[PDB]
Design a protein around this ligand. Structure first.
Ligand SMILES: CCCCCCCCCCCCCCCCCC(=O)OC[C@H](COP(=O)([O-])OCC(O)COP(=O)([O-])OC[C@@H](COC(=O)CCCCCCCCCCCCCCCCC)OC(=O)CCCCCCCCCCCCCCCCC)OC(=O)CCCCCCCCCCCCCCCCC
Ligand SMILES: CCCCCCCCCCCCCCCCCC(=O)OC[C@H](COP(=O)([O-])OCC(O)COP(=O)([O-])OC[C@@H](COC(=O)CCCCCCCCCCCCCCCCC)OC(=O)CCCCCCCCCCCCCCCCC)OC(=O)CCCCCCCCCCCCCCCCC
Ligand SMILES: CCCCCCCCCCCCCCCCCC(=O)OC[C@H](COP(=O)([O-])OCC(O)COP(=O)([O-])OC[C@@H](COC(=O)CCCCCCCCCCCCCCCCC)OC(=O)CCCCCCCCCCCCCCCCC)OC(=O)CCCCCCCCCCCCCCCCC
Ligand SMILES: CCCCCCCCCCCCCCCCC[C@@H](O)O[C@H](CO[C@H](O)CCCCCCCCCCCCCCC)COP(=O)(O)OCC[N+](C)(C)C
Ligand SMILES: CCCCCCCCCCCCCCCCC[C@@H](O)O[C@H](CO[C@H](O)CCCCCCCCCCCCCCC)COP(=O)(O)OCC[N+](C)(C)C
Ligand SMILES: CCCCCCCCCCCCCCCCC[C@@H](O)O[C@H](CO[C@H](O)CCCCCCCCCCCCCCC)COP(=O)(O)OCC[N+](C)(C)C
Ligand SMILES: CCCCCCCCCCCCCCCCC[C@@H](O)O[C@H](CO[C@H](O)CCCCCCCCCCCCCCC)COP(=O)(O)OCC[N+](C)(C)C
Ligand SMILES: CCCCCCCC/C=C\CCCCCCCC(=O)O[C@H](COC(=O)CCCCCCC/C=C/CCCCCCCC)COP(=O)(O)OCCN
Ligand SMILES: Nc1ncnc2c1ncn2[C@@H]1O[C@H](COP(=O)(O)OP(=O)(O)O)[C@@H](O)[C@H]1O
Lengths: 42, 121, 459, 107, 40, 320, 347
């Protein structure tokens, strides 16, 4: 109807996406470090 | 294969500890890109159903779809790789532990092997 | 190969974000550009193949078919530009999307180093075709034609999946290189006979073989123009390509399992050539001509001699180009006449001379006139079958005579004679149709200069 | 029978629109003259000029990877060597007999 | 000059209770538009 | 937070808003009567909300802009053509009747939604009930066929088996010669072509069938032309009577919640107005439907959702 | 009904299924089945009408008979071996009777007669829940005892189910009966691979659940029950018809769509056990499902059926309620073939 951009939902969606991406990056880094530790590569 | 009853299995663990001994999938993995593409397709279909400008209706919603699909795809790929590594490990251990059932083939050369010849006429 | 697959994929976003009045221009230009890129694949070597990666490889059998597939799409767009004038933008974009998906599936099919991937794409090529036939078709029989085309193909190809997974379970790999190198003879047993039948019938139904060709006249008549050309030019060659790829593991059983199919094809060529003589429709006549030529290709493949394979490849390419041209000409006639009947419009040569020239050239090429590649493939198959048995020459000569007869009958009925009086909407032929015919015919007369490019791996 | 004899509401079948009547020099591509002309131009340029000619020359001048001249030279050298030394040209056995082992029958 | 599309006569084939009508099922009636039957 | 099961779970109970003043009232009368004037007075005096009679372009008023669309895009029928040629060959009579009935159904749904959402009552002209009298007049005069009234009856029963009949029915009675004189005085060039038999059929279809059916389950206030002028007596009669025979007392919070879910979401309200029965008067060919729908889509604020139209002037499209 | 009561009943249905899946006692599994049946009945009767009542009573009779048979099988198994744990059945008669009980619960032929009528009587929402959620408990129980089931009985019942679903789907016109016969055929497909590999059973179950959820949500979105009501849809929301046709093509097993993944994989498994005739028969039988799906697609999207005048008014109003996860369901049911190896996750 006569609806403005709901800034609350937009902010929540952006925050969720950014948090998920940061968590994925950190998890990948930790996983590769743990694998290199276990296999004695570096 | 039925690895459900495999000994020493935690009943409800998505990724056991030993699965950390394997290389994690790269973030540029083609399968992860495919999950991202699936997320984008879901976003476009969501825009189409709601009767909104398909390409550029909600950028945040499409981004959230892509991110969620990539997240689940990454974890699913890790679990898949761990399960396949388990299967190969069990295969090799069993073939080592039972030498009688997997004898070494007497290696032969094509020179001293008679194969019947069927001419084409 | 990805240098070819990726641009074909990018054709979709290119089409969907184009302006409403510029989709045809962009699609045609970039399809032609893609064809130029595909030309590089033609330079095959006498050794194994161009093994690009673990998933795609190119041979000198796949190269001509790939080039023809990439070349056909611009012609399909120019042919479809006519009857889609009064269509909404979304539906035109969907049509171009279907054509692009068909080309992409065919490109991925023709290399397909693994047989299961080949089968998956070989059946994937069936959805866009069915959508095109049943959606943008004029007659009310397009639905029945689509059902026939779907079920005739799927019933034949379903046992092929079981045969392939069984072969993988026993042999251990379905990669074509490993399959070729590790091939072993098939013993004469009932199980091996049924494996042979399962592996062969799926490709023989699509070719099509005489007795299973009922779907082809319906699919060719009721389809739009682009569907007709893609059916007659490329989709018929899938069966022959698959058969020539898969006959490497069926020896020596084929040596006596080819008799029913050889007899069926060598008699059905005569039957369909005779059928072409008494026909009240143009598209049906061209479809039956395609059936006859594909029956000859079946005979060639089942003979299994180097000259047979060379002639089969040459005939495949030549028949594809010729049938596409003939369907184009029939569609141009039907657009002005709106009837699709051979004797309703007569004496069109007095009104449209250049189209009469194109008709004459297409009929001569279909007539297997030397030194065109049509006759090259024809003659190679004739010599190979003569080596197989001296009595085949009777059937082949009868087929040649009937082919000449019905080709010149098609030319004479529609071009010569006195024009029909009560038709006064025969407008002069556009530049689009003349360009379409020229782009159809010039590659044939150019390939007659370098036959080795289309003679297959056994050259 | 007061039925209208009309089964349903339908537009009349429109008559075909001649592309020449409103626009001579129509090229049979599009009803918009400028887009139509440019479509003709790009089709003719990329079909005939770019692909059909440059591609034909490229295929004509493709490097000999099939090794035809190489095979001719090898055959020439082999024939010269075998004729000079009195060898009987082509050999009946593709593979030398000594390397091959035949299972004994003793039947 | 027009692509054929189904008319009323073509659409009435799928309007029955079941496809391929027979003698036994000729007297069957399609269910009501809303899934409510008269209280009788 | 639009109304839904969650809102009902937390706070939204519609039995609290009803304060004995709701009293949905439909004012029904013969063609060119004083009912419209009367309905306005009742709504003004009782504090209710008046809904003008639903016409051809009623639905266009509630969606997008209130400006009506083209006749081809909304209704595909005209009342003047019905008056000029009642036996029109192209089945204009039924198309007009069905479009008007469906518009009245939409208006009734909107009125019920307003009543349940706010608690303030509504006043209506001819509702979905009493609309069948025009169909009977058309059929007896021979304007429409029997299959026509059969299809109308099917649609009416399916659509009206889910709504509460109005609390009070107000009927204004005017003799046929008097309304003929009123029509002549009106001056609308098409209206003097209304035959006296048509008006007589409308009146006796009103009296013989509609009035007893409303009487057996509701309250009926039959008023003559003179006594209907004085709205004070009408309002006093409205207050004096007490509603204890209809289904309204039997309704509770749960049934009211179900009805409120039904009245909103207009697609379900109009779902059964397009049942697949192919009468030649209402059915439309595939080509005509395609062309008309395509033309409808090109309207300014109709291509996308209400809030996602760039040409109208909606901004922040890429973040909604 | 009250929204709170409806939510409570749905939670109770899910809790019964969870109790069936997470329990190691036969008595607790029977209790979970009883709780599921007890709470599932009012969901069928949410929209009160004679058809719903008749469907609910048919469902109750069938489920009660199945539960009694299951309890008798449990009793016999306990008699011949004093074990309550769900493991090897230790008795042939008990295994046979429990197989019939679980067939009755699932809907496999010749115990399939109740599915079309129950689906037809009850609403779309009720039908959607019944078609997908109900299958999870009996399938889990069958997977837990797959090492004891007799291959002959399960295989012949699966073959009969595929044949019956394919044949019965051709005649029906109402969409709910078509869905019921489709479910029967899919379960015939899915239970045939139980003796060989339960992972294929779970994968087929997931794919089928996704496909049928998408199709039922599409049918709810465009409120159509009969074929002609669906044919009218193209005039208002053509996108819905296009998506429905794509999903129908997927459900027929056409590659490269997702619906080809189970069948193919299942065939592969039965080829590893030297079973060749049966997979071929089931493929040629699934051709019938493909046929009636194609007929529905012809009626719905690929052709434009005559419309109605009143439909004009429906052009002005938008769908007020949007169901979340519909685009995800469509994408998962159409374009997930390239990720087939993920089935190694033992899903
Ligand atoms: C491969 C597939 C890929 C995509 C998968 C799905 C995603 C999109 C589908 C959503 C639907 C949206 C839609 O309808 O299109 C309208 C829309 C344009 O119209 P619009 O004005 O915006 O809105 C109009 C309304 O949508 C509606 O308009 P309308 O209602 O007014 O028009 C009516 C029409 C509307 O009906 C439709 O348009 C149907 C929509 C398609 C169905 C979706 C199926 C779901 C996916 C299955 C795909 C199967 C593939 C397997 C092969 C089998 C094929 C069946 O309905 C009909 O015409 C009736 C008959 C339909 C004919 C037969 C139907 C066959 C459907 C099968 C489709 C299969 C191929 C789909 C390819 C993509 C098509 C969009 O299209 C788009 O804009 C989206 C296209 C993609 C956007 C790409 C942009 C990104 C590229 C730039 C960056 C470069 C990338 C690379 C990066 C690196 C470079 C450096
Ligand atoms: C004989 C060799 C001549 C070499 C000279 C160079 C010629 C180059 C031509 C290349 C292909 C032509 C393009 C096809 C479409 C024509 C365009 C057009 O619309 O014409 C209107 C244009 C203007 O006339 P207009 O008044 O404005 O239009 C009024 C109507 O169109 C009314 O039109 P119309 O009444 O004037 O008739 C049109 C005319 C033109 O239309 C055609 O039919 C031309 C197509 C004929 C081929 C039929 C298919 C059979 C397969 C043969 C494949 C060989 C191709 C070799 C490589 C070609 C490279 C592109 O049709 C004919 O005259 C009947 C042709 C039947 C000839 C049968 C003999 C074929 C085998 C002969 C031996 C070939 C290999 C020799 C090997 C040993 C010797 C070294 O007229 C012409 O341009 C005529 C062109 C000359 C005719 C050539 C026919 C034989 C040449 C075939 C290829 C040459 C082989 C290389 C040997 C070099 C030494
Ligand atoms: C693998 C797993 C496969 C899953 C199998 C398929 C699952 C489908 C069953 C889910 C329930 C069915 C449903 O919600 O309606 C169908 C629904 C269609 O929506 P609809 O037609 O608009 O709903 C009509 C209802 O009849 C309108 O219902 P209402 O008017 O009574 O509104 C009450 C509403 C609102 O609920 C409340 O009022 C919340 C108040 C909480 C009360 C606390 C009491 C606890 C003690 O609550 C519900 O609708 C039921 C929610 C139950 C909670 C489930 C967690 O479709 C789906 O839900 C698809 C679900 C997606 C798949 C499952 C998850 C993805 C995997
Ligand atoms: C007088 C001269 C007469 C003969 C002229 C012949 C001209 C031939 C032009 C046509 C060429 C056909 C296309 C060939 C494409 C296949 C080869 C292509 O894939 O190679 C790519 C390279 O392609 C070129 O970089 C780009 C060529 C594309 C353009 C061709 C020229 C014509 C283009 C016309 C476009 C439109 C013109 C403007 C119109 C307005 C990638 O190479 P790469 O795999 O890394 O190589 C590895 C080996 N290395 C390391 C030794 C290189
Ligand atoms: C209709 C349009 C075309 C469709 C496709 C047509 C092609 C299908 C035809 C099948 C090809 C041949 C099938 C079997 C070939 C084997 C040779 C056999 O037929 O000859 C004799 C076999 O004897 C009898 O034929 C036994 C089979 C009889 C039953 C088969 C049905 C025959 C008629 C059915 C025709 C139906 C065809 C279409 C079905 C829809 C030889 O006896 P024997 O040397 O000891 O056994 C040889 C096999 N060994 C060595 C492995 C043991
Ligand atoms: C209008 C009236 C007539 C006007 C025209 C007058 C001029 C007459 C000329 C017409 C024909 C006369 C014959 C002259 C032939 C000379 C050229 C010929 O010798 O070159 C051929 C070469 O031509 C090409 O090989 C043939 C063209 C390639 C075919 C590709 C088609 C173009 C792509 C379009 C898509 C294809 C669709 C189908 C896919 C399979 C043969 O090559 P080759 O003798 O060995 O040696 C070449 C040089 N070497 C030694 C360095 C190697
Ligand atoms: C379309 C395909 C189906 C998609 C299904 C919906 C996808 C979204 C589901 C969200 C995640 C699912 C599970 C949530 C993670 C936590 C639960 C986890 O602990 O469960 C583990 C198990 O994880 C799940 O099983 C894996 C879920 C992954 C499902 C996807 C596989 C589909 C394969 C083909 C499609 C490829 C993916 C397409 C995009 C999703 C425990 O396993 P375990 O208790 O020890 O073994 C029980 C099974 N037994 C009894 C047979 C031995
Ligand atoms: C256009 C319509 C065309 C229809 C084509 C349908 C016919 C195709 C040919 C038969 C298809 C089924 C063949 C099975 C797939 C091959 C698998 C295989 O080779 O495995 C065999 C198994 O062989 C079989 O099981 C074959 C059984 C066939 C059952 C189905 C019969 C279908 C119809 C048969 C007659 C059709 C033949 C002519 C068809 C002409 C076209 C109409 C080996 O068995 P093992 O278990 O390994 O034994 C080894 C230890 N001794
Ligand atoms: N179902 C219908 N069929 C034909 N005409 C109708 C229908 N419903 C309303 N109308 C028209 O609506 C007009 C207004 O009705 P009426 O109350 O008599 O006049 P007024 O609004 O001035 O009081 C009338 O001319 C009547 O014909």
């Amino acid at each position: 109807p006569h609806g403005s951009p709901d800034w609350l939902k937009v902010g929540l969606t952006l925050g969720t996406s950014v948090f998920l991406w940061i968590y994925l990056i950190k998890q990948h880094k930790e996983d590769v470090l743990e694998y290199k530790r276990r296999n004695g590569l570096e | 294969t039925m690895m459900s009853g495999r000994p020493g299995r935690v009943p409800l663990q998505f990724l056991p500890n030993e699965a950390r001994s394997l290389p994690p999938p790269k973030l540029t993995d083609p399968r992860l890109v495919y999950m991202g593409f699936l997320g984008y397709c879901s976003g476009l279909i969501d825009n189409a159903i709601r009767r909104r400008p398909v390409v550029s209706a909600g950028l945040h919603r499409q981004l959230l779809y892509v991110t969620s699909f990539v997240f689940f795809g990454y974890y699913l790929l890790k679990r898949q790789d761990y399960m396949y590594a388990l299967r190969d490990h069990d295969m090799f251990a069993y073939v080592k532990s039972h030498p009688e059932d997997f004898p070494e083939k007497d290696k032969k050369t094509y020179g001293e092997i008679l194969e019947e010849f069927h001419p084409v006429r | 190969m990805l240098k070819i697959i990726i641009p074909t994929t990018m054709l979709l976003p290119m089409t969907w974000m184009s302006k409403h009045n510029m989709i045809w221009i962009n699609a045609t230009v970039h399809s032609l550009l893609i064809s130029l890129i595909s030309l590089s694949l033609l330079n095959q070597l006498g050794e194994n193949s161009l093994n690009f990666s673990l998933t795609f490889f190119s041979d000198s059998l796949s190269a001509p078919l790939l080039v023809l597939t990439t070349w056909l799409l611009p012609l399909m767009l120019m042919a479809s530009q006519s009857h889609l004038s009064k269509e909404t933008t979304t539906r035109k974009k969907l049509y171009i999307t279907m054509l692009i998906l068909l080309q992409l599936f065919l490109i991925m099919t023709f290399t397909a180093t693994e047989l299961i991937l080949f089968y998956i794409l070989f059946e994937a090529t069936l959805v866009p075709t069915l959508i095109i036939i049943t959606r943008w078709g004029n007659q009310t029989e397009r639905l029945n034609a689509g059902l026939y085309f779907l079920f005739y193909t799927l019933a034949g190809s379903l046992p092929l999946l079981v045969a392939l997974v069984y072969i993988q379970n026993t042999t251990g790999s379905l990669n074509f290189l490993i399959i070729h190198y590790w091939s072993h003879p098939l013993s004469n047993s009932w199980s091996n006979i049924f494996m042979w039948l399962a592996c062969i019938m799926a490709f023989m139904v699509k070719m099509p073989l005489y007795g299973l060709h009922l779907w082809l006249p319906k699919a060719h008549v009721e389809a739009p123009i682009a569907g007709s050309m893609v059916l007659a030019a490329v989709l018929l060659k899938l069966g022959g390509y698959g058969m020539m790829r898969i006959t490497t593991i069926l020896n020596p059983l084929t040596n006596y399992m080819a008799y029913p199919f050889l007899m069926l094809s060598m008699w059905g060529m005569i039957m369909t050539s005779s059928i072409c003589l008494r026909q009240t429709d143009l598209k049906s006549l061209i479809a039956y001509s395609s059936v006859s030529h594909m029956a000859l290709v079946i005979v060639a493949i089942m003979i299994q001699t180097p000259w047979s394979f060379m002639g089969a490849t040459a005939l495949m390419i030549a028949h594809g180009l010729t049938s596409s041209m003939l369907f184009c000409l029939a569609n141009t006639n039907y657009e002005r006449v709106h009837s699709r009947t051979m004797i309703l419009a007569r004496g069109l040569q007095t009104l449209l001379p250049l189209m009469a020239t194109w008709w004459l050239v297409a009929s001569l090429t279909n007539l297997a006139l030397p030194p065109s590649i049509n006759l090259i493939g024809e003659l190679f198959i004739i010599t190979a079958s003569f080596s197989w048995s001296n009595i085949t020459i009777i059937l082949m000569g009868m087929n040649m005579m009937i082919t000449a007869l019905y080709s010149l009958y098609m030319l004479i009925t529609t071009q010569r004679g006195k024009y029909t009086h009560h038709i006064n909407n025969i407008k002069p032929s556009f530049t689009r149709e003349n360009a379409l015919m020229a782009l159809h015919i010039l590659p044939l007369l150019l390939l007659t200069l370098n036959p080795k490019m289309i003679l297959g791996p056994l050259y | 029978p007061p039925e209208p004899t009309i089964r349903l509401q339908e537009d009349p079948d429109p008559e075909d629109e001649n592309l020449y009547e409103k626009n001579p020099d129509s090229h049979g591509y599009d009803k918009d003259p400028i887009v139509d002309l440019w479509n003709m131009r790009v089709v003719f340029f990329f079909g005939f000029s770019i692909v059909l000619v440059l591609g034909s020359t490229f295929v004509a001048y493709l490097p000999d990877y099939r090794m035809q001249e190489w095979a001719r030279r090898e055959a020439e050298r082999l024939v010269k060597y075998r004729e000079a030394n009195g060898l009987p040209l082509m050999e009946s056995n593709c593979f030398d007999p000594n390397k091959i082992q035949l299972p004994e029958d003793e039947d | 000059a027009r692509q054929w599309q189904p008319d009323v006569e073509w659409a009435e084939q799928f309007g029955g209770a079941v496809m391929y009508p027979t003698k036994e099922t000729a007297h069957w009636k399609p269910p009501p538009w809303n899934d409510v039957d008269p209280p009788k | 937070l639009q109304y839904g099961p969650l809102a009902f779970v937390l706070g939204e109970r519609t039995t609290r808003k009803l304060t004995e003043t709701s009293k949905v009232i439909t004012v029904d009368g013969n063609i060119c009567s004083g009912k419209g004037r009367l309905a306005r007075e009742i709504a003004e005096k009782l504090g209710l909300r008046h809904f003008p009679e639903a016409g051809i372009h009623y639905a266009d008023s509630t969606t997008g802009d209130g400006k009506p669309l083209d006749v081809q895009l909304s209704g595909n029928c005209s009342l003047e053509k019905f008056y000029d040629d009642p036996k029109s060959n192209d089945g204009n009579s039924y198309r007009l009747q069905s479009w008007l009935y469906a518009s009245r159904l939409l208006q009734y749904a909107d009125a019920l939604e307003h009543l349940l959402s706010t608690g303030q009552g509504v006043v209506l002209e001819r509702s979905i009930y009493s609309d069948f009298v025009f169909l009977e007049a058309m059929y007896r005069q021979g304007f429409i066929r029997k299959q026509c009234v059969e299809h109308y009856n099917e649609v009416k029963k399916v659509t009206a088996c889910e709504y509460l009949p109005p609390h009070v029915v107000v009927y204004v009675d005017v003799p046929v010669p008097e309304i003929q004189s009123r029509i002549q005085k009106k001056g609308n060039p098409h209206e003097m072509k209304i035959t006296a038999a048509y008006l007589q059929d409308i009146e006796n279809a009103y009296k013989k069938t509609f009035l007893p059916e409303m009487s057996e389950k509701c309250e009926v206030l039959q008023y003559s032309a003179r006594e209907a002028e004085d709205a004070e007596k009408v309002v006093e009669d409205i207050e004096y009577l007490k509603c204890d025979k209809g289904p309204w007392p039997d309704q509770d919070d749960r049934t009211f919640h179900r009805l409120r879910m039904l009245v909103q979401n207009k697609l379900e309200v109009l779902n059964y107005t397009t049942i697949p029965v192919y009468l030649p008067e209402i059915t439309i060919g595939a080509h005509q439907s395609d062309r008309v729908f395509q033309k409808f889509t090109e309207l300014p604020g109709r291509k996308y959702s209400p809030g996602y139209n760039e040409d109208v002037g909606d901004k922040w499209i890429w973040l909604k | 009904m009250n929204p709170i009561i409806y939510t409570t009943l749905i939670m109770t249905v899910m809790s019964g299924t969870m109790l069936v899946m997470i329990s190691s006692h036969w008595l607790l599994i029977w209790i979970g089945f009883e709780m599921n049946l007890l709470a599932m009945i009012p969901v069928l009767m949410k929209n009160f009408n004679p058809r719903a009542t008749e469907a609910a009573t048919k469902y109750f009779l069938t489920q009660a008979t199945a539960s009694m048979m299951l309890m008798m099988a449990i009793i016999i198994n306990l008699l011949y071996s004093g074990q309550w744990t769900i493991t090897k059945m230790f008795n042939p008669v008990a295994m046979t009777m429990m197989t019939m009980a679980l067939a009755m619960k699932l809907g496999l032929s010749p115990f399939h007669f109740w599915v079309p009528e129950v689906t037809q009587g009850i609403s779309l929402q009720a039908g959607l829940l019944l078609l997908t959620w109900q299958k999870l408990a009996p399938l889990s129980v069958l997977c837990q005892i797959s090492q004891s089931i007799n291959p002959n009985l399960m295989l012949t019942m699966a073959m009969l189910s595929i044949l019956i679903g394919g044949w019965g789907g051709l005649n029906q016109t109402q969409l709910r009966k078509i869905m019921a016969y489709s479910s029967i055929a899919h379960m015939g497909w899915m239970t045939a691979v139980l003796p060989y590999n339960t992972t294929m059973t779970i994968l087929n179950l997931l794919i089928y659940i996704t496909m049928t959820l998408a199709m039922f949500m599409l049918l709810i979105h465009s409120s159509a029950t009969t074929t002609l009501s669906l044919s009218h849809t193209w005039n208002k929301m053509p996108v819905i018809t296009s998506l429905m046709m794509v999903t129908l093509l997927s459900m027929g097993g056409l590659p490269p769509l997702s619906g080809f993944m189970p069948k193919w994989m299942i065939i592969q498994e039965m080829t590893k056990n030297e079973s060749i005739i049966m997979p071929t028969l089931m493929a040629m039988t699934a051709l019938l499902n493909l046929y009636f799906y194609m007929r529905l697609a012809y009626s719905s999207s690929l052709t434009m059926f005559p419309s109605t005048n009143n439909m004009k008014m429906k052009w002005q109003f938008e769908h007020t309620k949007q169901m979340k996860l519909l685009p995800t369901m469509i994408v998962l049911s159409t374009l997930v073939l390239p990720m087939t190896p993920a089935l190694s996750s033992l899903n």
